[PDB]
Amino acid sequence: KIDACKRGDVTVKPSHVILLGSTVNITCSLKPRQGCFHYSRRNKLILYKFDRRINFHHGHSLNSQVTGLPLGTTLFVCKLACINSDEIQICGAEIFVGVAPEQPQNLSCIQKGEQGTVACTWERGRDTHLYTEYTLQLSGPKNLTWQKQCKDIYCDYLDFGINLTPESPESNFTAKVTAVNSLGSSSSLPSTFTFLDIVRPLPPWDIRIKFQKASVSRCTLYWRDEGLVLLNRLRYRPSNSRLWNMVNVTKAKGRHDLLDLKPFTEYEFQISSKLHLYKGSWSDWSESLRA
Amino acid sequence: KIDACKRGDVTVKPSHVILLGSTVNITCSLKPRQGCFHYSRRNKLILYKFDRRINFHHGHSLNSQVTGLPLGTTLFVCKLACINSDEIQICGAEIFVGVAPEQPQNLSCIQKGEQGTVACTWERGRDTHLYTEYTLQLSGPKNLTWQKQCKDIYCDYLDFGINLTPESPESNFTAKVTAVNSLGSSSSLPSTFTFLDIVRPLPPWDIRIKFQKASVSRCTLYWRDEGLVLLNRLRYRPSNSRLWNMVNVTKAKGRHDLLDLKPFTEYEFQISSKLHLYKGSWSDWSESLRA
Amino acid sequence: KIDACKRGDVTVKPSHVILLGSTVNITCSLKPRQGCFHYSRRNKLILYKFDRRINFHHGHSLNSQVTGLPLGTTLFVCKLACINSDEIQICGAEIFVGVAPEQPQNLSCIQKGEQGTVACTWERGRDTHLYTEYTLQLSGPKNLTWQKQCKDIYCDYLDFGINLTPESPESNFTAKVTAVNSLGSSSSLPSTFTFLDIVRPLPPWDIRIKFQKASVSRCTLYWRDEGLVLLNRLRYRPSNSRLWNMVNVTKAKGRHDLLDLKPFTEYEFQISSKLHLYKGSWSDWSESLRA
Amino acid sequence: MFPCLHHSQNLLRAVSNMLQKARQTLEFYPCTSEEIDHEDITKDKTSTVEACLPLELTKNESCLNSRETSFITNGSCLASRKTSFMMALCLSSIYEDLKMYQVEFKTMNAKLLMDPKRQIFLDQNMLAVIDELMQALNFNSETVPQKSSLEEPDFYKTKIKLCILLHAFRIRAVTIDRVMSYLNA
Amino acid sequence: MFPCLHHSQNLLRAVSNMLQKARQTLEFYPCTSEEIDHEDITKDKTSTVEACLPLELTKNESCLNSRETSFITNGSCLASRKTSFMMALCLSSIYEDLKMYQVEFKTMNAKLLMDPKRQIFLDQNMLAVIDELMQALNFNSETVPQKSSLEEPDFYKTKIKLCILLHAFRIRAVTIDRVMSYLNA
Amino acid sequence: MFPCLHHSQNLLRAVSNMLQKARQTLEFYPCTSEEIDHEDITKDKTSTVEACLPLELTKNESCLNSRETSFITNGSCLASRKTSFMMALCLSSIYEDLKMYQVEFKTMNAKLLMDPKRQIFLDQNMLAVIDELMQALNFNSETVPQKSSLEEPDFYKTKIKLCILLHAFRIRAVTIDRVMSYLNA
Amino acid sequence: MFPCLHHSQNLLRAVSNMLQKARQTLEFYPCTSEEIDHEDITKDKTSTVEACLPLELTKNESCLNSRETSFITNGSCLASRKTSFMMALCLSSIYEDLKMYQVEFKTMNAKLLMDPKRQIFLDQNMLAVIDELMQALNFNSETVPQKSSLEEPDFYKTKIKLCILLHAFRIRAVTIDRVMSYLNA
Ligand SMILES: *[C@@H]1O[C@H](CO)[C@@H](O)[C@H](O)[C@H]1NC(C)=O
Ligand SMILES: *[C@@H]1O[C@H](CO)[C@@H](O)[C@H](O)[C@H]1NC(C)=O
Ligand SMILES: *[C@@H]1O[C@H](CO)[C@@H](O)[C@H](O)[C@H]1NC(C)=O
Ligand SMILES: *[C@@H]1O[C@H](CO)[C@@H](O)[C@H](O)[C@H]1NC(C)=O
Ligand SMILES: *[C@@H]1O[C@H](CO)[C@@H](O)[C@H](O)[C@H]1NC(C)=O
Ligand SMILES: *[C@@H]1O[C@H](CO)[C@@H](O)[C@H](O)[C@H]1NC(C)=O
Ligand SMILES: *[C@@H]1O[C@H](CO)[C@@H](O)[C@H](O)[C@H]1NC(C)=O
Ligand SMILES: *[C@@H]1O[C@H](CO)[C@@H](O)[C@H](O)[C@H]1NC(C)=O
Ligand SMILES: *[C@@H]1O[C@H](CO)[C@@H](O)[C@H](O)[C@H]1NC(C)=O
């Protein structure tokens, strides 16, 4: 059995993890068999924080009560100094000062495209100086559920690998995030999302410009995107200065008889689609098409 | 959108999932545009359970109140019979009669060997005729829990992939199992297990028989097993008739000066080891060694 | 097209490859458009072998006749020195002096075990300072041959991937090796080998020592080897001093009633097998068995 | 021998076995070819019905509507410089047909698993064959993400829709097989 | 971290080690950067010199000459809908640059092996890195066939051409590395 | 060239880099060879100290204690009929030494990850090299299961134990390298 | 389900199809079970006839002759600590039976290819199944080297020997299948 501390053992009261503001009783105790080979009233049993002397007792039992510890870890190492020999490190304690975990104030779940993996994002709050474990739970109408745990201390987001297929377009799904640390536990308020709110249409991948198969000013734009789109929007703004973009386009993959400027000067084109007008987010504008 | 039901739609009150004993209002309704091409007072709108007639209304609206449904699924299909044409299936409902889920009375977690994956086993109880989801949670001394879901309707056991390394041999770890179904939720009582209780030593893999390097009756048995064993037991029973096996052996991988019968007749040998005498399960007897 | 020589071109007569003893006419010629920018009777057109001056002509045409070149490669580089500018390398020639290739005096083909890949070995002879290509051809009684080329300049042996299954134990197979180099070609004399000569039995892999299941001096040796062995030999020599080993053993995988010394002192044991007594090579002695 | 033709022959055989299982499992649900209407999900989205024809059969080229969905995705089934556009558009449309069906079949299977009993579930082997064929058809193959629901759907509707899709898919599988045979010969 | 950037960083390091070996092996042959002229085989064939620039640097777009060699081969290094055409043309041109060099390097190596001694031979690891990067750059990667000759070439000319190519290739390798770093960030 | 020797040379180099990182990360924790006692976990369990010697050095064979732990596990590093028992026992004992260390190193790493900060964590590459060498040493390789704890251990004790193990393991790594060199030559 | 049992069931089916082909191809050569004598090449070399029995059937253990050919080769089909020696010896003997047959079948196939016509040749799939089963049975599997002859053998003798081996091998294949079923249950 490998043992880190052989000469003596050091105890901490109440524990290595303490609430910000508490006082720890670091006590260095030396086993009777171990000790300075020659008894002398010169040898000492020092205690050091970051190699800084805090106490010194000739006797094997050393007691200290450190206070006002800041957030972080402080290494208290208790070395033995003999009469002529160099100091031998005996044992030490690492103390993590921590505070109660922040509750996530805002939780949002976004699925990219009709086929996508749901991803939920939260505001962690102040960082407790402690290991942090995050649990994300998603439940449907009745209480079935999916849970995943983000063991990583810092998590940008947690993604449910399982895709969500909604039994009906109007359903209620509720998501909650729980943060647990040695000192305490904070749980976010339940947030209820309908499937349309979670889904976000993909930007239209395709784009084509045709001048109505003619030299005429009128232009026809042939783009392609996800099948379930009941709305759309197009940018007809002149390239040199942005002006106005039509709020809505008809449910046509291929634009027809769009009003375009008579010159053939290059014009930037951007396109967006809305899965549902009543409760669907707008898609990101498609890569600009030059001319 | 492929539509299974076009001619008409059938509704169920309150829902397809009902508690054992409840009564469902299956109501078959026909859309006005669809119907018998020739109005006649001969055409009917039948409702069938497992192809057995339960009701018949000439009018488009048919109402039924089935009662005393047993546990299981009953297919109520509502067909349209016209005057001379054959019956056209219009729409149907599948009803799952279920009961509240049984709580697991006993939960036991066993880890095989010093290095093993913890596996927990429970008594499911009566089978509710419904989809069953089982969640197994393991919490250590402070609150840090591993979340695993057995989505399979029948689960013999759920295994935690991560091996448990105990900070100290005496620690308390608590395990709970939760069963959730459309109708209700039952959670097993928390059971607290120390690491020694969970661990079960492996049967000694190796075995060797030597007669003290001599023709003498005394025999030496050279076996090998997991390193952390503080106890052991050996079977010295005569092969022809089992007699008695020593309760404990010294902490020796290689037995020495064991009392063995003077004849060279074949003798079966079995060996077991105990990781901890105070709170450790006995290992399974090793494969019998002939002679 | 990256062009190595732009300022001028150098020719060699007869060729870069020459027989040992021949004289090469290295001639450095400068294209008219290229040359020293300022005509002066100070600029020279030097020719260097291993950066050692051999000739110098002011005129664009430089002629040299190097003689007594030793075996190897000599780099003749022809640089241009102008009046004040540093020498610019113009073009160069690498000459490989070589001699006619040695014929392989001895060719032997050995197959390891009943199942083995035939491998043929030859004595290359003196190394010609030239690229060497070796072709090994094996022809059976029927005029069908396997063609394999050892393009590597130095070849320890060439191995035929296909195993040879002999239509009859007495057959004649003939093997020849051909060496070809820019200067000449030498072919080894055809060597005819019967299948028994090519095959060499594997050393017996297994060995067991038993004293006739008793404390008696007589010993029984249970070894295992390739199935088609019609002979065998055993080493009964005392371990401390080698004495004599029996010339032949009966066709028994397991030796029985072998005469062994009464003491139990450790004895080395070696075993060999002969596939055919009339024309089969002896197998290598098996790993010594201690005691 | 054409490797894609072998995959297509495997596809038709896999659908034939699954269709036989579906009829046996769903005894009451009507799943005979006579009682099941033909409905094709890919009716307007893809041009397999027109583009996938023998070169002799297609001539006017007027009916190919403005190079409909002319993505012409390059793939390992053919070679880029090997065959005419008429077969290049066809291979892309066949890839799209398999993508539309696989996404739907996975959605049905995820709903079927929730059933308290296991009356019927889509063949894992058949789904794997569809994915393997798509990988050869187009290099930029997208693997459908595991689909699941947090609620329980009506099972009768899924079982009627399943039978309607299986029969329509079987007709599509023969059409793919005919094209693969033409490419081989 | 960008996987193609890691391959490009591996390429520059592999060329640096091979260039050091070449200078040590060919003591007389002049292989110092001062005595070796810069000659680029891909001078007019590819548009890496112009297309591969940071988006901020390229603006008029007039200098891109009529979308020169605008194959825009799709590949695993980028995603089809991820980056602007300026980087799509650049990745195709980089693939073409590596194809032109690998075909030439293999031809030189086959001639070098015939030498009675083994003064120098192209690093197998460097050639493997070039192939691995090309596979990521374009799905339709063509593997060069084993090249050999039935006669023996002059070795001095091959050794001078080798030094000229190695130095030019090293400059190309840094240019690829800069583009990969820009794509990552 | 011996493949196991290459793995052993990789092991010694990986430990050397990890040991340098450990000294830099733990500035206060004493991790110099002078202040760290030599403690070997495999002191009595394995016979590598005695079995792994050049054939010339070992002669009396009396010191090999009753074929201690003579499992003689067959493996891809040597061939079954290739070398003497003295090296067969040595290869088995080396496999056992790597198994004892890997199980312990994984336990330490699982405790280290829980630290609020990331002052030090065992090199994943070093652990992978240990597993690769064990796979070659013995066919019946056991992969250690992912280890985790439901509580937080004192970190100072783990960091002192880590330094003691790293230095002892480095000495073991040189011993394995010497044996692999002897097998090659 | 037992993976080795699946391989053994594949083996019996493969032999059954090859045996049917052999009878159809060799119309004159007598290949009916009635006219072909039973001759087993592995008559004395292996103890499959005695060792491979259900545990209930074998009791006296006297008939196992002095642990005949008791190599007990460890393998992936069983686990080292899983089953009794009676099945461990049986698995080794079955591996040896497959090695004796595969070496002979390859020798016959190499002679059959030389025939001016292609009346019959051993099924490549059947040979592959024998190799796959052997790999699972014993880790130290030896792959038979490609066999060839430099002369042409009489074909009638090879075709009579072939029929004698196929029928005997089929009986051996059922014996392996029975043992695999017993191991599974
Ligand atoms: C620390 O120890 C001192 C004396 O041993 C005692 O008076 C005090 O209450 C202790 N405080 C804590 C927080 O344990
Ligand atoms: C679902 O869970 C919530 C909170 O646990 C509870 O209030 C509600 O009654 C549950 N619903 C059912 C149907 O069990
Ligand atoms: C979801 O909840 C909202 C408000 O709580 C309610 O208006 C709506 O009907 C609910 N939807 C369903 C499907 O129950
Ligand atoms: C069923 O319907 C009838 C009449 O429509 C009504 O009287 C009864 O209360 C209903 N019962 C349930 C359980 O809905
Ligand atoms: C741990 O959890 C249990 C139940 O949730 C609770 O009673 C206990 O106070 C918790 N302990 C801590 C330290 O949070
Ligand atoms: C575990 O719990 C038991 C009883 O609840 C208690 O006696 C024991 O001290 C506990 N162990 C620890 C480490 O707290
Ligand atoms: C070399 O050249 C000289 C003069 O050019 C000529 O006399 C001589 O014959 C030549 N020798 C050979 C071997 O070409
Ligand atoms: C075989 O080849 C040798 C040499 O080429 C020749 O002498 C002999 O006649 C040949 N035999 C036949 C049968 O062709
Ligand atoms: C092989 O050649 C030798 C001598 O040339 C001859 O005695 C022997 O009969 C030959 N064998 C065959 C099979 O022809």
| DSSP string of A15-57, one letter each residue | -SEEETT--B--EEEE-SSSS-SS--TT-EEEEEESS-EEEEE
B186, amino acid identity: S
Give the integer Cα–Cα distance in Å for F168 and G152: 66
* C-D interface (Cβ pairs under 8 Å ≥ 3): no
CB-based burial label for E132 (10 Å; 0-12, 13-18, 19+):
middle
Closest Cα to atom 1 of ligand 2: A143
Q: Rounded distance, CA B71 to CA B74, Å?
A: 9
- Chain D nearest-CA distance from B190, in A, is 27
Tell me, in angstroms, the distance from the centre of ligand 2 to residue A173's CA: 13
Q: Which of A27, A57, A64, A65 to mutate to test the pocket of ligand 1 (most atoms within 8 A of CB)?
A: A65
Q: Which of residues 188-207 of C touch F (CB under 8 A)?
A: 205
Chain E residue whose CA is closest to A206? E81
Distances in whole angstroms, Cα of residue E2 to Cα of each of A100, E177, G119 = 39, 11, 58
CA distances from A31 to A25, A45, A75, E18 (A): 19, 13, 21, 63
**Residue in the block written with tokens 């109505």:** A212
Ligand 5 centre distance from Cα of residue A141 (Å): 29
- Verify whether ligand 1 is closer than 6 Å to residue A23 (CB atom): yes
| D161: nearest CB among B4, B77, B182 | B4
Q: What is the residue with the minimal CA distance to atom 6 of ligand 9?
A: C172
Q: Which ligand neighbours the alpha carbon of B196 most closely? A: 6
State the smallest CA–CA distance between residue C78 and chain E in angstroms.
Answer: 12
Tokens of D169: 């898919």
Tokens of residue B226, six digits:
């997991």
- Cβ atoms E137, E75 nearer than 8 A: yes
Structure tokens at B90: 């219009």
Interface of F with C in 80-109 (CB under 8 A): 81, 84
Give the Cα separation of E86 and E48 in Å (integer).
Answer: 11
Could you tell me the sign of the dihedral formed by the alpha carbons of C145, C150, C155, C160, in that order? negative
C287 contacts in chain F (CB < 8 Å): 81, 84
For ligand 1, the distance from its centroid to the CA atom of residue A36, given in whole angstroms, is 28
3-state secondary structure of E79: coil
Q: Does C287 touch chain F (CB under 8 A)?
A: yes
Q: Are B234 and B258 in contact (CB under 8 A)?
A: yes
Helix intervals (H) in A96-227: 195-198
Contact B94/D at CB under 8 A: yes
With a 6 A CB cut-off, is A63 part of the ligand 1 pocket? Answer: yes
Q: What span, in angstroms and rounded, lies between the C-alpha atoms of A99 and A126?
A: 10
Whose Cα sits closest to atom 10 in ligand 2?
A143
Taking CB atoms and an 8 Å cut-off, how many pairs form between chains B and G? 4
Strands B62-63 and B27-30, by their bridges, are: antiparallel
- Please name the residue whose Cα sits nearest to atom 2 of ligand 5: B143
- Which are the contacts of D14, defined by CB distance < 8 A and separation ≥ 6? D123, D125, D126, D129
Question: What are the residues of chain G with a beta carbon less than 8 Å away from any beta carbon of chain F?
Answer: 74, 80, 139-140
B-chain CB neighbours of D157 within 8 Å are: 4-5
Which strand (E) or helix (H) includes residue G94? Answer: helix G85-113
Question: Which among A109, A119, A115, A111 is positioned nearest to A226, based on CA atoms?
Answer: A115
Residues A248/A228, Cβ–Cβ less than 8 Å: no
The two tokens of residue G80 are 């080292």
Give the burial string for C168-205 (b: 16+ CB within 10 Å, else e): eeebebebbbbbbbbeeebebeebebbbbbbbbbbbbe
Euclidean distance between the first and the last CA atom of chain G, given in angstroms as a whole number = 9
**What amino acid occupies position E179?**
V
By CB atoms closer than 10 A (0-12, 13-18, 19+), residue B226 is: middle
Secondary structure element (H or E) that encloses residue G134, with its range: helix G124-137
Q: Are F2 and F184 in contact (CB under 8 A)?
A: yes
Q: How far apart are CA C220 and CA C224, in angstroms?
A: 13
Chain D residues closer than 8 Å to E80 by CB: 140
Pocket test for ligand 7, best of C15, C23, C25, C55 (most atoms within 8 A of CB): C25
**A247, exposed or middle or buried, with CB in 10 Å at 0-12, 13-18, 19+?**
exposed
List chain B residues with CB under 8 Å of A161. none
Q: CA of B286 to nearest chain G CA: how many angstroms apart?
A: 9
Cβ-Cβ contacts under 8 Å for C34 (sequence gap 6 or more): C6, C7, C8
The shortest CB-CB distance from E156 to any of C17, C94, C153 is to C94
Which ligand 2 atom is nearest residue B180's CA? 14
Q: With touching defined as 3+ CB pairs under 8 A, do chains G and C touch? A: yes
- State in Å: Cα C25 to ligand 7 middle: 6
Widest CA span in chain D:
55
Tell me if chain B has a CB within 8 Å of the CB of D3. no
Identify whether the C-beta of residue B114 lies closer than 8 Å to the C-beta of residue B199: yes
The Cα B86–Cα E128 span in angstroms is 72
Chain B contact present for F25, CB below 8 A: no
Ligand whose nearest atom lies closest to the CA of B279: 6
Residue G148 near chain C (CB below 8 Å): yes
Does A1 reach chain B within 8 Å, measured CB to CB? no
- Angstroms from C258 CA to nearest CA on chain G: 19
Closest CA to D140 of D72, D47, D67, D49: D72
Contact of G149 with chain C, judged by CB distance below 8 Å, is answered with: yes
What distance in Å separates the CA atoms of residue D122 and residue D107, rounded to the nearest whole number? 10
Dist. CA C253–CA C234, nearest whole Å: 11
Contact list, G145 vs chain C (CB under 8 Å)? 115-117, 161-163
Q: Which residues of G touch F73 (CB under 8 A)?
A: none
Resolution (A): 3.8
With 0-12 / 13-18 / 19 or more C-beta atoms within 10 angstroms meaning exposed / middle / buried, residue G59 is: exposed
CA of E154 relative to ligand 7 center, distance in Å: 21
Tokens of D126: 């058949």
Whether the CB of A172 sits within 6 Å of ligand 3:
yes
Measured CA to CA, the distance from residue D129 to residue D134 in angstroms comes to 9
H/E run at residue E170: helix E155-184
Name the minimum distance, in Å, from the CA of C48 to any CA of chain E: 11
Angle of helix G124-137 relative to helix G85-113, nearest 10 degrees, comes to 150
Which residues in chain A have their CB less than 8 angstroms from residue E81's CB? 205, 287
Spell out the residues 6+ positions from residue C73 whose beta carbon is closer than 8 angstroms to its own: C94, C95, C96, C97, C129, E116, E117, E155
> Which approach determined this entry?
cryo-EM
Q: Which of D139, D141, D142 to mutate to test the interface with E (most CBs of E within 10 A)?
A: D139
Angle at C13 between CA C8 and CA C15, to 5 degrees: 95
Which atom of ligand 4 is closest in space to residue B24's alpha carbon? 13
C173–G contact, CB cutoff 8 A: yes
